[PDB]
RNA sequence: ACCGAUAGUGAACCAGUACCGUGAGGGAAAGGUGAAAAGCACCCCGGAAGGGGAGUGAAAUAGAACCUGAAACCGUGUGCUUACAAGUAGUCAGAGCCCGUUAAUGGGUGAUGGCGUGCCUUUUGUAGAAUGAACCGGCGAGUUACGAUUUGAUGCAAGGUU
RNA sequence: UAACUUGGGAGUCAGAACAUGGGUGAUAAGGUCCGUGUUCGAAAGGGAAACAGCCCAGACCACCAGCUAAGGUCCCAAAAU
RNA sequence: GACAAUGGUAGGAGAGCGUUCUAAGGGCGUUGAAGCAUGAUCGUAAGGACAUGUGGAGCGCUUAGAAGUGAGAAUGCCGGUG
């Protein structure tokens, strides 16, 4: 803004005396390289809500995917050590749509290793969930353990 | 048709255009007399130039002199020189050298 | 869109030969002024000419009323300083008959350029003798 | 973010410039010369609809009692006599038939004569 | 539905801009009135 | 011969084989339309007078329904800071006169 | 002393209308058989025979 | 959900350097050939500069005053029009002459007639001889953080909320 | 066909001419200060030759349709020599 | 299908156009993107398409979000040219 630029501490000319027009600094808004009226600051953008709003706003993500068939309760994962390709042919098995959520009671390594690289696969645990992966997420899939975890949670 | 043209010559374009209009139009042999005998500043280097359009119309084409005649002429502004000169009282005033593009055109009518 | 217009492949000027003899000044170029406009034709059109001519003879025994032939003065100006003339209607008929009518009449017709050409089909002659018979010209009576 | 001002200005003032080809001088070059010429025809042209009625209508009653006084009549006498038989024939008509029909003419002349 | 988000009818509102042409109704002046204290940049009396 | 017809509050003069433009009517396209309202028969052939000719009616074909080339509308008023821009486009009907 | 209005083009190019360069009294040389000035002498033969 | 060469540090370039002052101090302007220098051997006019061919390349209206190249402004050619005329230069009406489009109640020019004293600011009131602008381009003025109040929306409710 | 109450946001505190009832001045002022109505201000259109305040009358847009107001009908210039 | 409303400065209220960026979805581009030039095109206004030439690598659309979001005047600042 005027105070931060750099120079422009003395008066150009006399205020009378000549056909120019009055002047105080040569680093004013109107002067080429001088001075900002009004610009971005930094500042935050985040606020608030009532925790009630929050458990409702969650549960109507977790409604809305069942109302369009797009929730399946697996048996378990057995995934000794990390492989995509395994993980991939998993998904072809259940015929899941090209962007898949995968839920789980607790993390576990090797579920989000071979399913991390995979493009439109996304992979987080049962109490980490959020409004924005449900409602991105073409399909659903939790797991039959973690499905009851997550009941409780809301309530 | 041939043509020749001199860029960034250092006389006024508006100097140069007095004696273009002596010549436009008339034949080649006829205009290299006029250019001649005038007593302008802007005759030897306008003849130069279409002296140099003549020897174009028979080296690289081949057409013969006797069928030469002015097609088009024209000069055209280049850059400017910006200059100072000092006045009275601490004042300076700018002045300005300005430069010409001259363009000649040779045809036979055919 | 239906309303006719006149143009000069379809225009009919006739010549007319009016009598001044006793008639008012006044009275008199008044009806010369709208033949010379053509208000009397059925085809008029506003922007262009469609008159006829006029040949007024006997101009020097036109009338006047009252003693408008000593109070009535025309002027004149030079654009020299002082340069202001003067001259009675009635010195006026008596030596030029013909600038009296010709002055009278130009002064009731519009001042633009198609009004100067329309002032240009007057004749006015102090006797009864034009020169003017090749054009055929027919009476007429004022109305 | 940073909003430059491009490609937003110079097509506005081009529109402004194509509506005055044909001005005199710098009213067909220049945007604040030719921008002042193009509001003040605007408005001219707004006025001159409205005297357009009023100008043709003015010609054709200049044109019926050029016609009417051919028969040794008036206008004011003429229109009176028609209006009495009901006849209801605008002057835009009345002139259109002057012009070329002038034994039809006639016969009107007769008919609003007769009503006095 | 991240494409297809619609808001609540009469919850939202756009702010008022002035000094942005004469159509709106608030260009040049803006609402200030004309060559007072109260026209004037950096307020004007105290509230009591 | 001719007819003075009246459509949408003014007066024509129409012929057979002609041309014209009135306001929008009621028929469409390829349809026809006839004049009711009669108001002199002209000619040399045997005339009527007024107010209207009981009868003698006209018949024309409907061939196009457009609108008029765009009109723009502005005014303002000086040292004011009023202005005002409008736009309009009036629909016409095009016939083609039969027979009278 | 100091113009009121700038001049317009139209108004420029009628003053201008007299501006123009002469074109001299040249005919050929009974010898040189170049082009020459009435009344001097030939610059590229040098005769005049007067 | 910061800038993109008048922006971003005064400085994208060797910048606290050209320059200014006795001095303490003040302080700029200057980015872009091509994928690859493959940067026009050779002939012609000219004292040179410059230019016309040839050649290189996909392209030289890409030849180092080198991507794209707007307006002011300066020139050449041409269809219509103008030397009897009093003009805020336009608008409405309208012959003649020259053309033929995003195809429709077409385009350009304009003999002649009607009407008509720029724009902004400031004022009881301005064609005003009251103020401001030579012209073109770029830049250039109700914003943000914490409190108060009122209205709309939303969750819960004798409870609501950290 | 309005009026009143509660709440949110304003602007305005330089006025002018004409008619009329008065003070002041000189039964001077396009003077000045109050009562009452209209117009301008913020109002285009027609008339008063030109002329914010006078007379008639309040422009949503388009049309080459008709009837009227003030004021007018010899010519400029629409309408009775 | 009916009657009734729509001159307007200081101001109050309402609905919209365009510009840069972001998140999802769906699409164009060396068989030629943006920009630029020209035209007799469409909408009630701000504005939106199409064809041709130039140009040579990026850019629209739909819904929503966030702003250094709109220039003819300040004897305004800088550059260019009368």
């Given at each position: 803004?005027?105070?931060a ?12 005396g000549?056909?120019?027009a009055?002047?105080?600094?040569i680093?004013?808004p ?7 009226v009004?610009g ?27 109302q ?13 050590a ?16 090209k962007?898949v959520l ?9 579920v ?5 690289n995979?493009?439109?696969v ?13 409602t991105?997420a073409?399909?659903?899939?939790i ?6 975890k997550?009941?409780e949670?809301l309530? | ?5 001199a860029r ?8 140069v ?7 436009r139009?008339?034949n ?11 007593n302008?500043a802007?005759?030897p280097?306008?003849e ?51 430069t ?10 055919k | 869109?239906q309303?006719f ?6 225009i009919?000027?006739?010549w007319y ?6 008639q008012?000044?006044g ?14 034709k ?40 002082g340069?202001?003339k003067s001259?009675t ?8 008959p013909?600038?009296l009518?010709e002055?009278?009449?130009?002064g009731?017709?519009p ?27 027919e ?5 | ?7 937003v ?12 080809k044909?001005?005199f ?22 006025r001159?609809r409205?005297?357009?009625?009023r ?7 200049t ?7 051919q028969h ?27 012009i070329?029909?002038?034994?039809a003419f006639?016969?009107?002349?007769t ?6 | 539905?991240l494409h297809?988000?619609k ?7 756009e702010?008022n801009?002035v000094?942005?042409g ?14 007072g ?12 | ?38 108001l ?5 052939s ?14 024309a074909?409907?061939?196009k ?8 509308v502005?005014?303002?008023?000086r040292?004011?800071?009023?202005k ?6 009036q ?6 006169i039969?027979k009278? | ?6 001049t317009s ?16 009294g040249?005919?050929e ?7 020459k000035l009435?009344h ?8 005049y025979?007067?």
């Amino acid at each position: 803004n005027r105070s931060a630029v750099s120079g422009g501490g003395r008066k150009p000319w006399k205020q009378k005396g000549t056909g120019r027009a009055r002047q105080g600094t040569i680093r004013a808004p109107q002067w080429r390289g001088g001075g900002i009226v009004f610009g971005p600051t930094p500042r935050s953008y985040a606020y608030k809500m009532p925790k009630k709003m929050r458990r409702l706003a969650l549960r109507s993500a977790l409604s809305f995917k069942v109302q369009e068939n797009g929730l399946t309760v697996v048996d378990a994962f057995n995934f000794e050590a990390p492989k995509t390709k395994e993980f991939k042919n998993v998904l072809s098995t259940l015929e899941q749509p090209k962007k898949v959520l995968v839920v789980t009671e607790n993390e576990d390594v090797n579920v989000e290793l071979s399913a991390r690289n995979i493009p439109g696969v996304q992979v987080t645990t049962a109490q980490g969930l959020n409004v924005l992966d449900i409602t991105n997420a073409d399909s659903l899939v939790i797991t039959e353990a973690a499905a009851k975890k997550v009941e409780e949670v809301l309530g | 048709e041939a043509k020749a043209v001199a860029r960034t010559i250092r006389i006024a374009p508006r100097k140069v255009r007095l004696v273009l209009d002596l010549i436009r139009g008339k034949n080649a042999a006829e205009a290299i007399a006029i250019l001649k005998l005038t007593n302008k500043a802007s005759s030897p280097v306008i003849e130069k130039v279409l002296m140099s359009a003549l020897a174009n119309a028979e080296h690289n084409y081949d057409m013969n002199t006797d069928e030469l005649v002015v097609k088009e002429a024209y000069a055209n502004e280049g850059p400017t020189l910006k200059r100072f000169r000092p006045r009275a009282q601490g004042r300076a005033s700018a002045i300005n050298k300005r430069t010409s593009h001259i363009t000649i055109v040779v045809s036979d009518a055919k | 869109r239906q309303t006719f217009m006149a143009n000069e492949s379809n225009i009919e000027r006739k010549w007319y030969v009016i009598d001044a003899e006793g008639q008012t000044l006044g009275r008199l170029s008044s009806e010369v002024a709208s033949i010379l406009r053509g208000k009397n034709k059925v085809t008029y059109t506003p922007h262009v000419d469609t008159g006829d001519y006029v040949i007024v003879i006997n101009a020097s025994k036109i009338e006047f009323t009252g003693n408008k032939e000593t109070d009535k003065v025309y002027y004149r100006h030079s654009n020299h300083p002082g340069g202001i003339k003067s001259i009675t209607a009635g010195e006026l008929r008596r030596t030029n008959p013909e600038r009296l009518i010709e002055n009278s009449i130009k002064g009731m017709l519009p001042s633009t350029r198609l009004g100067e050409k329309q002032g240009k089909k007057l004749f006015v002659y102090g006797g009864a003798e034009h020169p003017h018979a090749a054009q055929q010209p027919e009476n007429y009576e004022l109305r | 973010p940073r909003v430059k001002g491009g490609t937003v200005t110079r097509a506005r003032r081009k529109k402004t410039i194509k509506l005055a080809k044909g001005y005199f001088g710098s009213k067909h070059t220049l945007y604040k010369v030719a921008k002042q010429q193009v509001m003040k025809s605007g408005q001219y042209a707004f006025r001159d609809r409205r005297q357009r009625k009023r100008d043709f209508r003015k010609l054709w009653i200049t044109r019926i009692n050029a016609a009417a006084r051919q028969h040794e009549m008036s206008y004011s006498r003429l229109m009176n006599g028609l209006k009495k038989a009901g006849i209801d024939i605008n002057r835009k008509m009345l002139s259109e038939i002057a012009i070329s029909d002038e034994k039809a003419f006639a016969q009107l002349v007769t008919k609003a004569k007769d009503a006095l | 539905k991240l494409h297809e988000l619609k808001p609540a009818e009469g919850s939202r509102k756009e702010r008022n801009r002035v000094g942005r042409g004469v159509a709106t109704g608030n260009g040049k002046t803006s609402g200030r009135g004309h060559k007072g204290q109260k026209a004037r940049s950096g307020g004007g009396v105290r509230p009591g | 011969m001719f007819a003075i017809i009246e459509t949408g509050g003014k007066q024509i003069k129409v012929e057979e084989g002609q041309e014209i433009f009135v306001e929008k009517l009621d028929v469409n396209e390829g349809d026809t339309f006839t004049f009711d309202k009669v108001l002199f028969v002209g000619g040399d052939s045997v005339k009527v007078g007024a107010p209207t000719v009981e009868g003698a009616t006209v018949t024309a074909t409907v061939n196009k329904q457009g609108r008029g080339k765009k009109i723009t509308v502005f005014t303002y008023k000086r040292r004011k800071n009023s202005k005002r821009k409008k736009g309009h486009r009036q629909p016409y009907t095009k016939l083609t006169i039969d027979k009278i | 002393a100091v113009p009121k209005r700038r001049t317009s083009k139209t108004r420029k190019n009628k003053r201008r209308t007299h501006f123009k360069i002469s074109v001299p009294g040249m005919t050929e040389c009974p010898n040189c058989g170049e082009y020459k000035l009435s009344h001097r002498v030939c610059k590229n033969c040098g005769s005049y025979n007067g």
